[PDB]
Amino acid sequence: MDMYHTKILKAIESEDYISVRRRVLRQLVESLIYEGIITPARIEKEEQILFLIQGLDEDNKSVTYECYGRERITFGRISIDSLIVRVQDGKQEIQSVAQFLEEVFRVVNVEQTKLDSFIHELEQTIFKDTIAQYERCKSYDELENHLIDGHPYHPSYKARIGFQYRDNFRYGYEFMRPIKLIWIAAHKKNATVGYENEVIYDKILKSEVGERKLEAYKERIHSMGCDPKQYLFIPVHPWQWENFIISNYAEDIQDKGIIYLGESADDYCAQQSMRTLRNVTNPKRPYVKVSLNILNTSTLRTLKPYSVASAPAISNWLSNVVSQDSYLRDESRVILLKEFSSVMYDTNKKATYGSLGCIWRESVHHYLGEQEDAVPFNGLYAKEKDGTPIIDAWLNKYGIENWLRLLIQKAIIPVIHLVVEHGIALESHGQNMILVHKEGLPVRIALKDFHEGLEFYRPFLKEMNKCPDFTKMHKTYANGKMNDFFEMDRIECLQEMVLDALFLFNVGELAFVLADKYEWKEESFWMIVVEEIENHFRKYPHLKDRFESIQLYTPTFYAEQLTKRRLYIDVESLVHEVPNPLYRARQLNIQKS
Amino acid sequence: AMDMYHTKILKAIESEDYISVRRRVLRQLVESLIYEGIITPARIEKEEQILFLIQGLDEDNKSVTYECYGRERITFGRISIDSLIVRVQDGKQEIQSVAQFLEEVFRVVNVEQTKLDSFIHELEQTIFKDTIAQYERCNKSYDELENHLIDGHPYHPSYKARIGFQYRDNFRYGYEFMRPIKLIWIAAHKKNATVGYENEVIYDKILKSEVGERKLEAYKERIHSMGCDPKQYLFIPVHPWQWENFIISNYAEDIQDKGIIYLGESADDYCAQQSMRTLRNVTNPKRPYVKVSLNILNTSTLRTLKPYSVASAPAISNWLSNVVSQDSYLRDESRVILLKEFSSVMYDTNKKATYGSLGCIWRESVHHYLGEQEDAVPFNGLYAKEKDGTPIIDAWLNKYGIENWLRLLIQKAIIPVIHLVVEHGIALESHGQNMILVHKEGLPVRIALKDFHEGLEFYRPFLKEMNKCPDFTKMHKTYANGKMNDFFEMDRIECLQEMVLDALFLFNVGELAFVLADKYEWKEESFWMIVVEEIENHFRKYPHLKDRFESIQLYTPTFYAEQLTKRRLYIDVESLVHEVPNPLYRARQLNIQKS
Ligand SMILES: [Cl-]
Ligand SMILES: [Cl-]
Ligand SMILES: [Mg+2]
């Protein structure tokens, strides 16, 4: 029982445990109410709404949870502004997420086994975020790690299922511990580089492994009676290696389908993603994104085999699109961090699916000019331990309206441009975006993580015949159907990625911060947004009909219910209708002319 | 950097011990799938041998066949598979993938996919954990044998799963590695913590010894300086894996509110037994064992302690102790030892997820009982073998002779268990790990029994005193809301016959008959004819037991044995039981032919 043991106990006994508990509860309740999963009584007061949530205790008798909140013009999102108080005889602030959920779900029905996992994820989030917060007291690399807060919406934004406290201290991105990758050799019976990636992959091994070290690895392979020409080389997260590959691949290790080689020469360090590591020794070198079998936000951190296969072809396709577009290339100067090489070992087995794979991505340091710095886009709405907006200084310096205008211009507009001019919808969540700035002045946007979340509407492409052919890349694409991967047959996929991903779940978080902290009204926020959208597309008259057909000004739209998906089995279409703030903003924008 | 433990794991996986373990795990798997009728291969009979042809389908839905040779044995019709398991499609190849074997076989035969995946995972983890153990083993007192029999269960195809241990934890806590460990002491608030039923006085006394007055005093002073009242807490020892990987992360809210308070480490070192949640005191061998909660899955079940069973443990042991001390045969002739679970404590809340997760039962050290020339061996040790295949009882058999040794064994070991059933209506769970042979240089002396709290069944009409039967309904709220057959008490007399045939014989004593036949050419028929003679010899001394003995029907031709593997492949099923022949039946027929 060492110092890390002591740390963990102190973290829990501290005020940071209370604070983290209150936050998970807050976020949980906002989400249940917003999505209409529960339906409290609502008593209106001047600004606030008092919600009364019904439940039943273990004894099948009545209980109320009280809290005060707001229903916001920004997509009708709910903010809970107070403690969540359990009323039976006497009032007390809720101590147990588990108790809260089960009392509340005796009244409203859910699938029990889903409830159980969800409760476990919320508890683990509290646990893991408690010690992150207890452990905290810039520039891009530091900021990635030091914004430890994680997701503003998802009740369990920290679960890390499969990490107990020591692994968490070792691997959690908040702690910034250097680590080494494990190099293995993987037999070509089951291993493949990314589609049409062979030349690039062979070149990247030269710089990544090192030339001499690679020769020495091949000699060792020969010294076992194996033929190095029959193998590819894959880096593996050391946690993944020790806790997953060794036990689940034993059969491949015994027959030399997999050969342990050794440790990377360079040290690496986790990013917000944690399956994504930067080279600490040489920061110009590519990041590596590797398989991790760990459950964070209800999904395993595995890399899908079809997705790994296609990552390089996708980055090459996108890079061409952007390079032939004068606005994106010359004016907004958008940055795409290319996932330019990939490799994987994929056997039939269901249990190991997506468990060993790697994608290399360009460092954002390749792109940063001198004088330029970068911040993760979800950092723009982040706060200091004492609750001060991390962008406070900048806003004081540049003014709120001017800073926000520039932000919309350098960051939001290019994303929407891509949707309307190209029918290409990049996953627009804050975690995919990085703002490049100069002393806090917004300059250009960088985008990443294409291989997982990209969507597109084929008829809008400039060249349909240049659209990468997915069916030739993987048997899974080949046997798949329309809408399963990347391609939508519905034009509404475009409207939805913009309203839902870009605005409701990401940029909208900024509007909350500016309203509550600087008294900059949400109506004025969406005003600026409409104005900049309009200033852009007025320069592109041929886009007029198409802009309209996308309907960004629709008075309401159907938004994903992300939390409901966690409580229910069928989950076919879980959407709820919400108001669209752009609608009213545009009506006022029109009157104002 | 990757260390020497990493290097070991890799060498073990890359070695020949991996091939043997894989082969063994496949063998036990196929044996039980055929035995329980989960699959029904074609059977082609040679003189003795059977060729088994098992159907499957590959992923392209093309037929495949698995082939092996084996036997159906007179001992309960158990299946022995004597040859490698070969996959036949185009060519023939020994099967390398337990997952593939199971996937192909279950494309033909329907199971629950979900259960199939877990089972495959457990089989792979078994292979993985046992490979490291077989690889580390080299080429003996009681304590030394507990940790040196590394083979685990001869029936269950995954006998090593240990779901929740990766290789490093396995090295630390796996009983094969005999690593000394410290218990973690916690204080638990009496709002949720209780001593076992009517155990308060014995518990207070046992904390004196186990913690020490000095430490306990210092423990109380620590709680007091946190502004908590030392009189509101009990004290529970926790496995250090359980504390760090389970309690700390799942009890955070109890730690926050001082429902649970960390005190420190035990003074003494402990070492795991075959059970791994049961720890012996290494520093002071006469001190009691600790059986503690562990949330890991071995053989498909969580290693938690059921709260109701922790609560009734001290009372069950007092009850059994009294039954023995008033019976001349058991007390005087047999001299049976019952290692008493004499104290227990737990912290138990509502939460479903932590159910059974923090609990402790203390048990008497077998060293309390051993005479000056006596030693002890775990009962499943009797059928264990050395890495090279020599039965570990080999020297003893050479010294006393086989028939003489087997008769003494039956007379001192098997008879008193059966006596308990017939005279007392009490069936202790009689499997191999519940029994300890006490011997003098390999001469069988007497039997010691353990693990009462979970396993025991009884038939109320058979009790010598039905009113001395402990009233469980008063001990825990789960017993009081429970129904007949739920815990400990069976309404059917067949409960008793099944505990003898199925637990004592089929899954335990029968394994010895296999070893004697295959190693020494001692025929299974002779083995069972000795068992019958000895049972008869005993009961001819107790005429008052005749009609009771008859009604139990140990000589019935066929009976219903548990299907243990089937249970791992289905959520719900109609039976769980299958009919097997009883070797005591024919043996008795023949024993009768003497007169
Ligand atoms: Cl980083
Ligand atoms: Cl012999
Ligand atoms: Mg046992």
Coordinates of N, CA and C in Angstrom, one line a residue, chain B residues 21-149:
Chain B
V21 N -1.7 -28.2 -22.1 CA -2.9 -27.6 -21.4 C -4.1 -27.5 -22.3
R22 N -3.7 -27.1 -23.5 CA -4.8 -26.9 -24.6 C -5.4 -28.3 -24.8
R23 N -4.6 -29.3 -24.9 CA -5.1 -30.6 -25.1 C -5.9 -31.1 -24.0
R24 N -5.5 -30.9 -22.8 CA -6.2 -31.3 -21.6 C -7.6 -30.6 -21.6
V25 N -7.6 -29.3 -21.8 CA -8.9 -28.5 -21.7 C -9.8 -29.0 -22.8
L26 N -9.4 -29.3 -24.0 CA -10.2 -29.8 -25.0 C -10.7 -31.2 -24.6
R27 N -9.9 -32.0 -24.0 CA -10.3 -33.4 -23.6 C -11.4 -33.3 -22.6
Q28 N -11.3 -32.5 -21.5 CA -12.3 -32.4 -20.5 C -13.6 -31.8 -21.1
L29 N -13.4 -30.9 -22.0 CA -14.6 -30.3 -22.7 C -15.4 -31.4 -23.5
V30 N -14.7 -32.1 -24.3 CA -15.4 -33.1 -25.2 C -16.0 -34.2 -24.3
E31 N -15.3 -34.6 -23.3 CA -15.8 -35.6 -22.3 C -17.1 -35.2 -21.7
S32 N -17.2 -33.9 -21.3 CA -18.4 -33.5 -20.6 C -19.5 -33.2 -21.6
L33 N -19.2 -32.7 -22.8 CA -20.3 -32.4 -23.8 C -20.9 -33.8 -24.3
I34 N -20.1 -34.8 -24.4 CA -20.7 -36.1 -24.7 C -21.4 -36.7 -23.5
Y35 N -20.7 -36.7 -22.4 CA -21.3 -37.3 -21.2 C -22.7 -36.8 -20.9
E36 N -22.9 -35.5 -20.9 CA -24.1 -34.9 -20.5 C -25.1 -34.9 -21.6
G37 N -24.7 -35.4 -22.8 CA -25.6 -35.4 -23.9 C -25.9 -34.1 -24.6
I38 N -25.0 -33.1 -24.4 CA -25.2 -31.8 -25.0 C -25.0 -32.0 -26.5
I39 N -24.1 -32.9 -26.9 CA -23.9 -33.3 -28.3 C -24.1 -34.9 -28.3
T40 N -24.5 -35.4 -29.5 CA -24.8 -36.8 -29.6 C -24.0 -37.3 -30.9
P41 N -22.7 -37.5 -30.7 CA -21.9 -37.9 -31.9 C -22.3 -39.3 -32.4
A42 N -21.9 -39.7 -33.6 CA -22.0 -41.0 -34.0 C -21.0 -41.8 -33.2
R43 N -21.3 -43.1 -32.8 CA -20.5 -43.9 -32.1 C -20.2 -45.2 -32.8
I44 N -18.9 -45.4 -33.2 CA -18.6 -46.7 -33.8 C -17.8 -47.6 -32.8
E45 N -18.3 -48.7 -32.5 CA -17.6 -49.5 -31.4 C -16.6 -50.5 -32.0
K46 N -15.4 -50.4 -31.5 CA -14.3 -51.4 -31.5 C -14.6 -52.4 -30.4
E47 N -13.6 -53.2 -30.1 CA -13.8 -54.2 -29.0 C -14.1 -53.4 -27.7
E48 N -13.2 -52.5 -27.3 CA -13.3 -51.7 -26.1 C -13.6 -50.2 -26.5
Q49 N -12.7 -49.7 -27.3 CA -12.8 -48.3 -27.8 C -14.1 -47.9 -28.5
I50 N -14.4 -46.7 -28.5 CA -15.4 -46.1 -29.3 C -14.7 -45.0 -30.2
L51 N -15.0 -45.0 -31.5 CA -14.7 -43.8 -32.3 C -15.8 -42.8 -32.3
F52 N -15.6 -41.6 -31.8 CA -16.7 -40.6 -31.8 C -16.5 -39.7 -33.0
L53 N -17.6 -39.5 -33.7 CA -17.6 -38.6 -34.8 C -18.6 -37.4 -34.5
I54 N -18.1 -36.2 -34.3 CA -18.9 -35.1 -34.0 C -19.1 -34.2 -35.1
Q55 N -20.3 -33.9 -35.4 CA -20.7 -33.0 -36.6 C -20.5 -31.5 -36.3
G56 N -20.1 -30.8 -37.3 CA -20.1 -29.3 -37.2 C -20.3 -28.7 -38.6
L57 N -20.3 -27.3 -38.6 CA -20.3 -26.6 -39.9 C -19.3 -25.4 -39.8
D58 N -18.6 -25.2 -40.8 CA -17.7 -24.0 -40.8 C -18.4 -22.8 -41.1
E59 N -17.7 -21.6 -41.2 CA -18.4 -20.4 -41.3 C -19.1 -20.2 -42.7
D60 N -18.6 -21.0 -43.7 CA -19.2 -21.0 -45.0 C -20.3 -22.1 -45.1
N61 N -20.6 -22.6 -43.9 CA -21.7 -23.5 -43.7 C -21.4 -24.8 -44.5
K62 N -20.2 -25.2 -44.5 CA -19.8 -26.5 -45.1 C -19.5 -27.5 -43.9
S63 N -19.9 -28.7 -44.1 CA -19.8 -29.7 -43.0 C -18.4 -30.0 -42.6
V64 N -18.2 -30.2 -41.4 CA -16.9 -30.6 -40.8 C -17.2 -31.7 -39.8
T65 N -16.2 -32.5 -39.5 CA -16.3 -33.6 -38.5 C -15.1 -33.5 -37.6
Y66 N -15.4 -33.7 -36.3 CA -14.3 -33.9 -35.3 C -14.3 -35.3 -34.8
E67 N -13.1 -35.9 -34.8 CA -13.0 -37.3 -34.5 C -12.1 -37.6 -33.3
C68 N -12.5 -38.5 -32.5 CA -11.6 -39.0 -31.4 C -12.0 -40.4 -30.9
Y69 N -11.0 -41.1 -30.3 CA -11.3 -42.3 -29.7 C -11.4 -42.2 -28.2
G70 N -12.3 -43.0 -27.6 CA -12.5 -43.0 -26.2 C -13.3 -44.2 -25.7
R71 N -13.7 -44.1 -24.4 CA -14.4 -45.2 -23.8 C -15.6 -44.7 -23.0
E72 N -16.6 -45.5 -22.8 CA -17.6 -45.3 -21.9 C -17.4 -46.2 -20.7
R73 N -17.2 -45.7 -19.5 CA -16.7 -46.4 -18.3 C -17.8 -46.9 -17.4
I74 N -17.5 -48.1 -16.8 CA -18.5 -48.6 -15.8 C -18.7 -47.6 -14.6
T75 N -17.8 -46.7 -14.5 CA -18.0 -45.8 -13.3 C -18.9 -44.6 -13.8
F76 N -20.1 -44.8 -13.5 CA -21.2 -43.8 -13.8 C -21.4 -43.5 -15.3
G77 N -20.9 -44.3 -16.1 CA -20.9 -44.1 -17.6 C -20.0 -42.9 -18.0
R78 N -19.1 -42.5 -17.2 CA -18.2 -41.4 -17.6 C -17.5 -41.7 -18.9
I79 N -17.3 -40.6 -19.7 CA -16.6 -40.7 -21.0 C -15.2 -40.4 -20.8
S80 N -14.3 -41.3 -21.2 CA -12.9 -40.9 -21.3 C -12.5 -40.7 -22.7
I81 N -11.8 -39.6 -23.0 CA -11.4 -39.4 -24.4 C -9.8 -39.7 -24.5
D82 N -9.4 -40.8 -25.2 CA -8.0 -41.2 -25.1 C -7.1 -40.7 -26.2
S83 N -7.6 -39.9 -27.2 CA -6.8 -39.6 -28.3 C -7.0 -38.1 -28.6
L84 N -6.1 -37.5 -29.3 CA -6.3 -36.1 -29.7 C -7.6 -35.9 -30.5
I85 N -8.1 -34.7 -30.4 CA -9.3 -34.3 -31.1 C -8.9 -33.7 -32.5
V86 N -9.4 -34.4 -33.5 CA -9.0 -34.1 -34.9 C -10.1 -33.5 -35.7
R87 N -9.8 -32.4 -36.4 CA -10.8 -31.8 -37.3 C -10.7 -32.4 -38.7
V88 N -11.7 -33.0 -39.2 CA -11.7 -33.6 -40.6 C -12.6 -32.8 -41.6
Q89 N -12.0 -32.2 -42.5 CA -12.7 -31.7 -43.7 C -12.1 -32.1 -45.0
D90 N -11.0 -31.5 -45.4 CA -10.3 -31.9 -46.6 C -9.3 -32.9 -46.1
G91 N -8.3 -32.3 -45.2 CA -7.4 -33.2 -44.6 C -7.8 -33.4 -43.2
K92 N -6.9 -33.9 -42.4 CA -7.1 -34.1 -41.0 C -6.1 -33.2 -40.2
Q93 N -6.5 -32.5 -39.2 CA -5.6 -31.8 -38.3 C -6.1 -31.7 -36.9
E94 N -5.2 -31.8 -36.0 CA -5.5 -31.7 -34.6 C -6.0 -30.3 -34.4
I95 N -7.1 -30.2 -33.6 CA -7.7 -28.8 -33.5 C -6.9 -27.9 -32.6
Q96 N -6.6 -26.7 -33.1 CA -5.8 -25.7 -32.4 C -6.6 -24.6 -31.7
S97 N -7.9 -24.5 -32.0 CA -8.7 -23.4 -31.5 C -9.9 -23.9 -30.8
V98 N -10.0 -23.7 -29.5 CA -11.2 -24.1 -28.7 C -12.4 -23.3 -29.2
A99 N -12.2 -22.1 -29.5 CA -13.3 -21.3 -30.0 C -13.9 -21.8 -31.3
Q100 N -13.0 -22.2 -32.2 CA -13.5 -22.8 -33.5 C -14.2 -24.1 -33.3
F101 N -13.6 -25.0 -32.5 CA -14.3 -26.2 -32.2 C -15.7 -25.9 -31.7
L102 N -15.8 -25.1 -30.7 CA -17.2 -24.8 -30.1 C -18.1 -24.1 -31.1
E103 N -17.5 -23.1 -31.9 CA -18.4 -22.4 -32.9 C -18.9 -23.4 -33.9
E104 N -18.1 -24.3 -34.4 CA -18.5 -25.2 -35.5 C -19.5 -26.3 -35.0
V105 N -19.2 -26.8 -33.8 CA -20.1 -27.8 -33.2 C -21.5 -27.2 -32.9
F106 N -21.5 -25.9 -32.5 CA -22.8 -25.2 -32.1 C -23.5 -24.5 -33.3
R107 N -23.0 -24.6 -34.5 CA -23.8 -24.3 -35.6 C -24.8 -25.4 -35.9
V108 N -24.4 -26.6 -35.6 CA -25.3 -27.7 -35.7 C -26.3 -27.8 -34.5
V109 N -25.8 -27.6 -33.3 CA -26.6 -27.8 -32.1 C -26.8 -26.4 -31.5
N110 N -28.1 -26.1 -31.2 CA -28.4 -24.7 -30.7 C -28.1 -24.5 -29.2
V111 N -27.4 -23.3 -29.0 CA -27.2 -22.9 -27.6 C -27.4 -21.4 -27.5
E112 N -27.4 -20.8 -26.3 CA -27.5 -19.4 -26.1 C -26.1 -18.7 -26.5
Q113 N -26.2 -17.9 -27.5 CA -25.0 -17.3 -28.1 C -24.2 -16.6 -27.0
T114 N -24.9 -15.7 -26.3 CA -24.3 -15.0 -25.1 C -23.6 -16.0 -24.1
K115 N -24.2 -17.1 -23.8 CA -23.6 -18.0 -22.8 C -22.4 -18.7 -23.5
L116 N -22.6 -19.1 -24.8 CA -21.5 -19.6 -25.5 C -20.2 -18.7 -25.6
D117 N -20.4 -17.4 -25.8 CA -19.3 -16.5 -25.8 C -18.5 -16.5 -24.4
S118 N -19.3 -16.3 -23.3 CA -18.6 -16.3 -22.0 C -17.9 -17.6 -21.7
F119 N -18.5 -18.7 -22.1 CA -17.9 -20.1 -21.9 C -16.6 -20.2 -22.7
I120 N -16.6 -19.8 -23.9 CA -15.4 -19.8 -24.8 C -14.3 -19.0 -24.1
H121 N -14.7 -17.8 -23.6 CA -13.7 -16.9 -22.9 C -13.1 -17.6 -21.7
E122 N -14.0 -18.3 -20.9 CA -13.5 -18.9 -19.7 C -12.6 -20.1 -20.0
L123 N -12.9 -20.8 -21.1 CA -12.0 -21.9 -21.6 C -10.6 -21.4 -22.0
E124 N -10.6 -20.2 -22.7 CA -9.4 -19.6 -23.2 C -8.6 -19.1 -22.0
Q125 N -9.3 -18.5 -21.0 CA -8.6 -18.0 -19.8 C -8.0 -19.1 -19.0
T126 N -8.7 -20.3 -19.0 CA -8.3 -21.5 -18.3 C -6.9 -21.9 -18.9
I127 N -7.0 -22.2 -20.2 CA -5.8 -22.5 -20.9 C -4.7 -21.5 -20.6
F128 N -5.0 -20.2 -20.6 CA -4.0 -19.2 -20.4 C -3.4 -19.3 -19.0
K129 N -4.2 -19.3 -18.0 CA -3.7 -19.4 -16.6 C -3.1 -20.7 -16.3
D130 N -3.5 -21.8 -16.9 CA -2.9 -23.1 -16.4 C -1.6 -23.3 -17.1
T131 N -1.5 -22.8 -18.4 CA -0.2 -22.9 -19.1 C 0.9 -22.2 -18.3
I132 N 0.7 -21.1 -17.7 CA 1.7 -20.4 -16.8 C 2.1 -21.3 -15.6
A133 N 1.0 -21.8 -15.0 CA 1.3 -22.7 -13.8 C 2.1 -24.0 -14.2
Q134 N 1.6 -24.7 -15.2 CA 2.3 -25.9 -15.6 C 3.8 -25.6 -16.1
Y135 N 4.0 -24.4 -16.6 CA 5.3 -24.0 -17.1 C 6.2 -23.7 -15.9
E136 N 5.7 -23.1 -14.8 CA 6.5 -22.8 -13.7 C 6.9 -23.9 -12.7
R137 N 6.1 -25.0 -12.8 CA 6.2 -26.1 -11.9 C 7.5 -26.9 -12.1
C138 N 8.1 -27.4 -10.9 CA 9.3 -28.2 -10.9 C 9.2 -29.7 -11.1
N139 N 10.3 -30.4 -11.2 CA 10.3 -31.9 -11.3 C 11.3 -32.6 -10.3
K140 N 6.2 -33.9 1.5 CA 5.3 -32.7 1.4 C 4.3 -32.8 2.6
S141 N 4.3 -31.7 3.4 CA 3.3 -31.5 4.5 C 2.0 -31.0 3.8
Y142 N 1.0 -30.8 4.7 CA -0.4 -30.4 4.2 C -0.3 -29.1 3.5
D143 N 0.2 -28.1 4.1 CA 0.2 -26.7 3.5 C 1.0 -26.7 2.2
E144 N 2.1 -27.4 2.1 CA 2.9 -27.5 0.9 C 2.1 -28.2 -0.2
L145 N 1.3 -29.2 0.1 CA 0.5 -29.9 -0.9 C -0.7 -29.0 -1.4
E146 N -1.3 -28.2 -0.6 CA -2.4 -27.4 -1.0 C -1.9 -26.6 -2.2
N147 N -0.7 -25.9 -2.1 CA -0.2 -25.1 -3.2 C 0.6 -25.9 -4.3
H148 N 1.0 -27.1 -4.0 CA 1.7 -27.9 -5.0 C 0.8 -28.7 -5.9
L149 N -0.5 -28.9 -5.5 CA -1.4 -29.5 -6.5 C -2.0 -28.4 -7.3

